[PDB]
Write a protein that binds this DNA or RNA. Structure first.
Ligand SMILES: [Mg+2]
Ligand SMILES: [Mg+2]
Ligand SMILES: [Mg+2]
Ligand SMILES: [Mg+2]
Ligand SMILES: [Mg+2]
Ligand SMILES: [Mg+2]
Ligand SMILES: [Mg+2]
Ligand SMILES: [Mg+2]
Ligand SMILES: [Mg+2]
Ligand SMILES: [Zn+2]
Lengths: 94, 37, 148, 120, 94, 67, 50, 49, 177, 86
RNA sequence: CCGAGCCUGGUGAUAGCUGGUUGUCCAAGAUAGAAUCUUAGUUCAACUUUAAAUUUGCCCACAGAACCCAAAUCCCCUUGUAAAUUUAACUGUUAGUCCAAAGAGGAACAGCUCUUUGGACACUAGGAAAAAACCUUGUAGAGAGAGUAAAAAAUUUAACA
């Protein structure tokens, strides 16, 4: 007795989940935070034409720095010291 | 399943929470309008 | 694994912290090979900073064997008699130095799981808790529902 | 079907009592939005998650500064439900070069330029 | 010595007799032992608390399985308190 | 102490107390094992760590009359 | 109906929450919901709903 | 630490419980009148900068 | 402290004999508290490995009262083991047969479902009437208070309370009553 | 617990975030000497300086854009003046 | 052990078919479709990976994009950010399930089937009872520290002159 048809959370007939005041409080909190977010999003500080052409310089320097870092790709340097330090394994006290 | 159904199609939990929070909160005075007034 | 491995309660040797602190690493015995690319690290360590090690730590004693070995070893025993064998085979000098320094810092007691990260021989003040601490008494000591 | 939701601009039109309660003066408005991520980027569309990635808020509970300008407010509107925002407060003026190091934030959205680390 | 207390190092006999001897050396009356609290008296695990009171004033309380164990433990407590070797005493200075 | 105590808001004054503690030993912690395993996917990996640990002993505590 | 939707003390109404999209609820919702705000579910109609 | 304190020195934990009860009473007085009153003495807070 | 080690341990982990009276109390609350004390949660030294339980005894289970129409609503059900042995008895008849079974099974449900449940149920004690064997009305410690109050009856309300209580309305004289 | 109260009072919801419980030094030499800064505090402070420099640059760029708009509007004014003078 | 014997050789017969496939550690990584004696497969495209050259790449601001007879979309300077294209070399995936939404078929049935936008799963963790697909939540460790997230169903019913 007490069986559910098929799976418990899907299909034409499922186990009916219900709401709790815990979830109600949680969601009202989320949405009131979102309402104050709307408020603070309002009243901008500058206009489109005011803010049009100020950051293009910084964006340009950023993109050219990225280009330089990407172009800077080569093999590393090789050195006689790094090569010949492999000879140091056969040392022994005389 | 389909949108319109013969039975009441059980809805998503988020939606059911939203509908359970959104109701007509009747504006009542602190005093009942019969005994005092 | 904790249940497979033994355990101990945290403790110090002889209560070293109260009195004068003493470096309770007693002895080191290095076994190195003249030949062998594996013993190059030990040889260069003995060259540079084993002298400085002994001079920094006069209390400890150091023996060097310098005998043919396919693998260089370091043996160290502590005040308790705790033995510690370690293999420095194919090991760099800076990490060998850190190893020796940590052995000098380490005490004479084998490393295993510690049940408790502290130890207080005088834990309880104001009297240990018993069930009758936080409840009152009765007039001339009467149990509930008792005439005399 | 599910699509990018257009927001009517009338939503972002403050009322007199809204001003009175939030203490946000429309005249002489703030300049900078402190932002923090409250919601999971999972179970969210690719545009929302990659937009917050572009803004640079992969890490939660991390106050990050953006401008108060329409181009950014667009993305902020798009991912508004995922974030707690608040404008920047400072009584002590901009941080001087001498006080670059003794800076500290507050839960009230304020930025103290000096941090003496002891009570009044 | 810091760890173990007195009577693990220095065993004694007739602690209550030694206690009355000490109290009469200090010129006070011979106190009486009185059970303050008890539980499970008929139970297989009797538990008693004995207090040593002089002139209607207490000096030491002691738990015990039985009355004798409780009173001798209270005598030991009084001895520790008198000699000043209470576990809550000033640690050794360095 | 046995009959009193002093609370901070949050912490007490510096010169009011003086808590001296000595370091006694530094060691590698006993080897702690961490492995991740998944089912029917040949995903198995093991790793062993030896976290460093230090031991202190508190020598003495004293109180100043400065209230 | 009109006086109830005028005099409801709830500061939160389906039209507001939907036109705002304050929790991505347009996911669970339909575009028809914008005009079928709360009263409708498929063919049904709850007049008490607001 | 609250646990081991209540274990080994119950007098201090009883002091803490009395402190908490008094703070509850101060909070109730504040719930009655938030301002327009002298704030609780223990409810007073420290300002750091 | 300045106590000895073994006596200190003994007094710390010792057992306690709690008593309660079941005169007009709810078995729900009574079993909740009895479970707390049997587990020994009230001891701040509680951990599952040490059986820090305490003996509990309750009196006058016969004079127990539920909240609601539970005397009829509730159904204590048990299967004997044979076919058709699926017996059910309402709380009323189950009480008439055995007045303690209600409270003991209530605590049986309250307590954890580990094998310690049976041991703690053994430690529990039970009496439908205000009478006790000598040993276990002797070896007691303390009688903690009851969860709820008992409302007074008209014969119990003194006269001065009635006089202090103001009368609310004036009846007309012409009325049979 | 109490994080909301700490926030309404002005402190961090988590005491480990900021304040005297976490920013102060955790140890000092018995002789009274100052201990070296720990890596957590060092990285937090570096992050704070980066944050502050970012705030400064952002505000400077916003003010520069506003000033550039003002200059461009003045240009437009003076060039209309030129036009009707022609 | 005869739908046509047993033995040997070709013969290690072939098999898109089943099964199996050995030491340690790390990183990136399921992704439109077309043709096929083709749908248990394969080839190409796409996706994924690797190493390099180059520069624009994602979000996008006004404006712009049909007569017939709705949610959104395309392009798109700025701004926010750092990726994208091309080149050289292959492999593998290419029989997919639920949910929300727009539709069709069906019975306005299916844990049904088929397309589209999106999400999750086939990767870890907490919760709804156990629970793939529901809600929170992702970059990995030691802790005998702390603050939060989603997170517990409420209902009792009809007198009448
Ligand atoms: Mg099933
Ligand atoms: Mg659908
Ligand atoms: Mg044949
Ligand atoms: Mg073959
Ligand atoms: Mg095939
Ligand atoms: Mg990976
Ligand atoms: Mg573009
Ligand atoms: Mg299907
Ligand atoms: Mg199906
Ligand atoms: Zn009335």
């Amino acid at each position: 007795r007490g069986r559910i048809p098929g799976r418990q959370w899907i299909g034409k007939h499922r186990r009916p989940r219900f709401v709790s005041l815990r979830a109600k409080q949680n969601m009202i909190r989320r949405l009131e935070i979102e309402a104050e977010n709307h408020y603070w999003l309002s009243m901008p500080y500058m206009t489109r034409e005011q803010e049009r052409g100020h950051a293009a310089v910084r964006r340009r320097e950023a993109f050219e720095a990225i280009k330089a870092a990407a172009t800077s790709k080569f093999p590393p340097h090789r050195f006689i010291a790094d090569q010949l330090d492999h000879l140091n394994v056969t040392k022994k006290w005389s | 399943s389909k949108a319109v159904t013969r039975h009441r199609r059980v809805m998503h939990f988020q939606r059911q929470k939203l509908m359970a929070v959104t109701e007509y909160i009747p504006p009542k005075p602190a005093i009942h309008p019969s005994c005092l007034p | 694994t904790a249940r497979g491995t033994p355990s101990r309660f945290l403790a110090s040797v002889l209560h070293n912290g109260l009195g004068r602190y003493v470096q309770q690493l007693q002895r080191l015995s290095f076994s190195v090979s003249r030949d062998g690319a594996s013993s190059r690290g030990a040889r260069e360590f003995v060259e540079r900073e084993v002298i400085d090690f002994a001079r920094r730590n006069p209390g400890v004693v150091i023996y060097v064997n310098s005998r043919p070995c396919c693998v260089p070893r370091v043996v160290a025993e502590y005040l308790n008699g705790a033995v510690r064998e370690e293999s420095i085979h194919c090991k760099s000098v800076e990490e060998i130095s850190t190893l020796v320094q940590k052995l000098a810092d380490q005490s004479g007691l084998d490393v295993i799981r510690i049940r408790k990260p502290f130890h207080t021989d005088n834990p309880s003040i104001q009297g240990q808790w018993h069930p009758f601490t936080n409840k009152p008494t009765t007039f001339r000591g009467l149990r509930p529902r008792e005439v005399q | 079907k599910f699509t990018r939701s257009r927001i009517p601009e009338k939503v972002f039109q403050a009322s007199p009592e809204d001003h009175e309660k939030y203490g946000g003066d429309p005249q002489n408005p703030h300049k900078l939005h402190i932002v923090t991520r409250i919601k999971s980027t999972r179970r969210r569309p690719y545009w929302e998650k990659d937009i917050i990635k572009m803004l640079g808020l992969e890490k939660a509970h991390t106050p990050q500064v953006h401008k108060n300008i329409p181009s950014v407010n667009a993305k902020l509107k798009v991912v508004k439900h995922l974030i707690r925002i608040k404008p920047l407060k400072l009584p002590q003026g901009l941080p001087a070069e001498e006080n670059m190091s003794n800076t500290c934030l507050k839960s009230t959205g304020e930025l103290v330029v000096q941090w003496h680390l002891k009570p009044v | 010595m810091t760890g173990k207390e007195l009577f693990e190092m220095w065993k004694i006999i007739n602690p209550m007799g030694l206690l009355v001897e000490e109290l009469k050396k200090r010129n006070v009356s011979a106190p009486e032992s009185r059970l303050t609290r008890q539980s499970g008296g008929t139970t297989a695990l009797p538990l008693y608390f004995v207090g040593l009171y002089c002139d209607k004033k207490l000096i030491a309380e002691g738990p015990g399985e039985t009355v004798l164990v409780a009173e001798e433990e209270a005598a030991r407590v009084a001895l520790r308190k008198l000699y000043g070797f209470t576990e809550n005493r000033r640690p050794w200075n360095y | 102490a046995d009959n009193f105590t002093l609370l901070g808001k949050p912490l007490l004054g510096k010169d009011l107390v003086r808590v001296e503690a000595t370091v006694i030993e530094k060691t590698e912690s006993w080897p702690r094992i961490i492995m991740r395993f998944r089912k029917r996917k040949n995903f198995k990996k093991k790793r062993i760590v030896t976290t460093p640990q230090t031991v202190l002993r508190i020598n003495s505590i004293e109180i100043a009359p400065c209230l | 109906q009109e006086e109830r939707e005028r005099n409801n003390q709830n500061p939160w109404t389906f039209e507001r929450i939907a036109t705002a999209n304050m929790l991505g609820i347009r996911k669970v919702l339909s575009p028809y919901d914008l005009t079928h705000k709360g009263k409708y579910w498929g063919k049904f109609y709850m007049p008490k709903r607001v | 630490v609250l646990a081991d304190l209540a274990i080994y020195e119950p007098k201090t934990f009883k002091s803490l419980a009395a402190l908490a009860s008094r703070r509850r009473h101060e909070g109730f007085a504040a719930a009655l009148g938030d301002g327009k009153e002298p704030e609780g003495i223990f409810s007073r807070v420290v300002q750091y900068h | 402290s300045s106590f000895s080690r073994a006596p200190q341990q003994w007094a710390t982990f010792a057992r306690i004999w709690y008593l309660l009276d079941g005169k007009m109390q709810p078995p729900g609350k009574l079993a909740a508290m009895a479970s707390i004390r049997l587990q020994g949660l009230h001891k701040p030294v509680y951990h599952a490995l040490s059986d820090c339980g305490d003996h509990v005894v309750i009196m006058n289970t016969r004079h127990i009262a539920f909240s609601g129409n539970k005397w009829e609503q509730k159904v204590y059900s048990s299967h004997t083991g044979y076919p058709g042995g699926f017996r059910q008895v309402t709380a009323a008849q189950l009480h008439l047969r055995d007045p303690v079974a209600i409270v003991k099974l209530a605590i049986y449900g309250m307590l954890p479902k580990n094998l310690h449940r049976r041991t703690m149920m053994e430690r529990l004690h039970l009496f439908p009437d205000e009478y006790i064997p000598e040993d276990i009305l002797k070896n007691l410690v303390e009688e903690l208070p009851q969860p709820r109050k008992i409302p007074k009856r008209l014969d119990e309300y003194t006269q001065e309370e009635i006089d202090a209580f103001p009368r609310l309305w004036t009846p007309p004289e012409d009325y049979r009553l | 617990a109490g994080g909301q109260w700490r926030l309404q009072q002005g402190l961090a919801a988590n005491p480990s975030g900021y304040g005297p419980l976490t920013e102060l030094p955790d140890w000092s030499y018995a002789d009274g000497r100052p201990a070296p800064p720990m890596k957590g505090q060092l990285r937090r402070k570096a992050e704070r300086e980066t944050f502050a420099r970012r705030v400064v640059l952002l505000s400077q760029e916003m003010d520069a854009g506003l000033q550039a708009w003002q200059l461009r509007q003045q240009k437009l004014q003076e060039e209309q003046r030129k036009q009707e003078n022609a």
